[PDB]
Amino acid sequence: ASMHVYILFAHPSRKSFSREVLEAFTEGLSEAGHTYEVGDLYRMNFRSELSQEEYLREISQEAGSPLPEDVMEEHERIGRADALAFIYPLWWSDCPAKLKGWFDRVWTYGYAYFYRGTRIDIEKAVVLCSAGHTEEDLEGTGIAESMRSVMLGDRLLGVGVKNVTMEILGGMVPGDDSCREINLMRARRAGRNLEHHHH
Amino acid sequence: ASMHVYILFAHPSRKSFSREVLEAFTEGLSEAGHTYEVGDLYRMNFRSELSQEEYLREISQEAGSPLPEDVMEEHERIGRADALAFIYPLWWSDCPAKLKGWFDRVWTYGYAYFGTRIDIEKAVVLCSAGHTEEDLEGTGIAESMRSVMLGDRLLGVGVKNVTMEILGGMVPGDDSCREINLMRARRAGRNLEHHHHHH
Ligand SMILES: Cc1cc2nc3c(=O)[nH]c(=O)nc-3n(C[C@H](O)[C@H](O)[C@H](O)COP(=O)(O)O)c2cc1C
Ligand SMILES: Cc1cc2nc3c(=O)[nH]c(=O)nc-3n(C[C@H](O)[C@H](O)[C@H](O)COP(=O)(O)O)c2cc1C
């Protein structure tokens, strides 16, 4: 059955490998008959810093407290989705600040977590992260593990996403296209195969 | 010997536990004869998003290419220091987007990596968390944070020695761990000079 994905995309450039990954993933989605919408956070000029007001609201732990309009819009986008996707380059072993801020501001008390329960209704999340380092190298530095723990674990499974998968699209150092085609295939496959998961 | 510390502080609120942590840490530094400068990133209106123009510069990998004025100022502040400190609340298992963006923008090619130009004897991380350090150690999050913050972002750019204190148990409405955590923060300032040496 057709699924609808909300894809969070975090990159300042119009053209970069991350954009190609987005194109490949959506290509795979289309082949399988799935749809998507994109939260192109840089192009949206999405505010990434949790404000003093928002912080005080979060600390107050009042699930019915107001949220800013941009966060309300994000929640509406998620509400239309059966799946989430996150497409970004690995910067200093985590997401770009812009996407980190999306978690800080959008994973709100009473929505992503409350006292622990959740209101997020998402069957699957796909993380497609491109890195300069190879997957082999990222495993050795504990960085691959940190990504599974922090991104897949804490930020996704930890807020009620039912199933998660990640492709670390590694080896993407400047001026080296050797891993490009293989990584784009992995992205296409991820979109084509969205409906399938563990049980 | 007296050391100078450049302290990166990341929190939107005028009053928070992190602010008291800063106060406790600075008290210890002064007790021990050390000096410091605080970079209050929110107060500074610090731009946390790596822009398209900065991105192109970083990808080009030209050590001598121009840097934004705000980044140049950060490099001067670091240059005056013998030590760095990072004081922030744990948000979604990493630092606030504001501090993440500081790494994205300030750890530039030709400076933080290329070899390194960073000349810093010690970095201290004081991270306040809702979860206890015990629970974070148990789940793998503490290890992830060591791999990411201590490993990649600090040791990985040439910092010679690193320490992280997880000041945990700071859940809303509970002051039970407050005094002990402030004691730890103060101690970290007082004991800044402590370092391992060959037997
Ligand atoms: C600011 C910055 C930080 C980066 N940090 C890492 C890193 O921590 N680990 C890694 O493997 N690659 C790192 N890289 C390399 C990027 O992951 C790589 O350039 C990216 O995946 C390429 O995708 P893009 O063309 O969409 O930018 C970094 C690149 C930049 C510009
Ligand atoms: C947006 C947000 C995200 C948080 N994420 C985490 C987390 O991932 N793990 C954790 O142990 N505590 C988390 N907390 C609890 C904070 O770490 C806690 O509020 C903070 O340490 C208190 O210090 P402060 O008064 O300086 O903000 C989070 C709090 C907020 C507001």
Numbering used by the authors:
A (entry chain B): -1 to 113, 118 to 201
B (entry chain A): -1 to 112, 119 to 203
What did the study's authors say about this model?
In the present study, the gene product of gene ID 9704440, here referred to as MmNQO, was cloned, overexpressed in E. coli and characterized biochemically and structurally. Based on the results from these analyses, gene ID 9704440 codes for a soluble protein of 196 amino acids. Based on structural and biochemical data, we suggest that FMN and NADH are preferred, which justifies that MmNQO is annotated as an FMN-dependent NADH:quinone oxidoreductase. The biological function of MmNQO is yet to be elucidated, but from the data presented here it may constitute an archaeal counterpart of the modulator of drug activity B in bacteria.
The crystal structure of MmNQO features a homodimeric enzyme where each monomer adopts the flavodoxin-like α/β-fold commonly observed for NAD(P)H:quinone oxidoreductases. The active sites of both monomers are situated at the dimer interface, each with a non-covalently bound FMN molecule bound approximately 8 Å below the molecule's surface. The flavin isoalloxazine ring is firmly bound by the protein with its dimethylbenzene nucleus interacting with hydrophobic side chains (Trp89and Trp90 from molecule A; and Leu48 and Tyr53 from molecule B); the N5 atom of the central phenylenediamine ring forming a hydrogen bond to the backbone amide nitrogen of Trp90; and the O2 and O4 oxygen atoms in the pyrimidine of the isoalloxazine ring forming hydrogen bonds to the backbone amide groups of His135 and Ser91, respectively. There are two non-crystallographically related homodimers (A/B and C/D) in the asymmetric unit of the crystal. In each dimer, one monomer (A in the A/B dimer and C in the C/D dimer) packs such that the ultimate histidine of the C-terminal hexahistidine tag is reaching into the flavin pocket to interact with the FMN ring in a crystallographically related molecule, i.e. His203 in molecule A interacts with the FMN in a crystallographically related D monomer and Asp156 in a crystallographically related C monomer. This interaction places the A-His203 CE1 atom 3.1 Å from the O4 atom of D-FMN. Although local conformational changes may well change the precise details and relieve steric hindrance, His135 is very strategically positioned at one side of the FMN cofactor to restrict the substrate-binding region, a feature that does not exist in bacterial FMN azoreductases. At the sequence level, the region responsible for binding the adenosine part of FAD in SmMdaB is overall very similar in MmNQO, i.e. loop A (residues 9–15) and loop F (residues 173–182), including an important interaction offered by His9 to the FMN α-phosphate group. An additional interaction to the monophosphate is provided by Tyr53 in MmNQO, which is absent in SmMdaB. In the FMN-bound state of MmNQO, loop F is folded around the monophosphate moiety whereas in the FAD-bound state of SmMdaB, the F-loop is folded away to accommodate the adenosine ring.
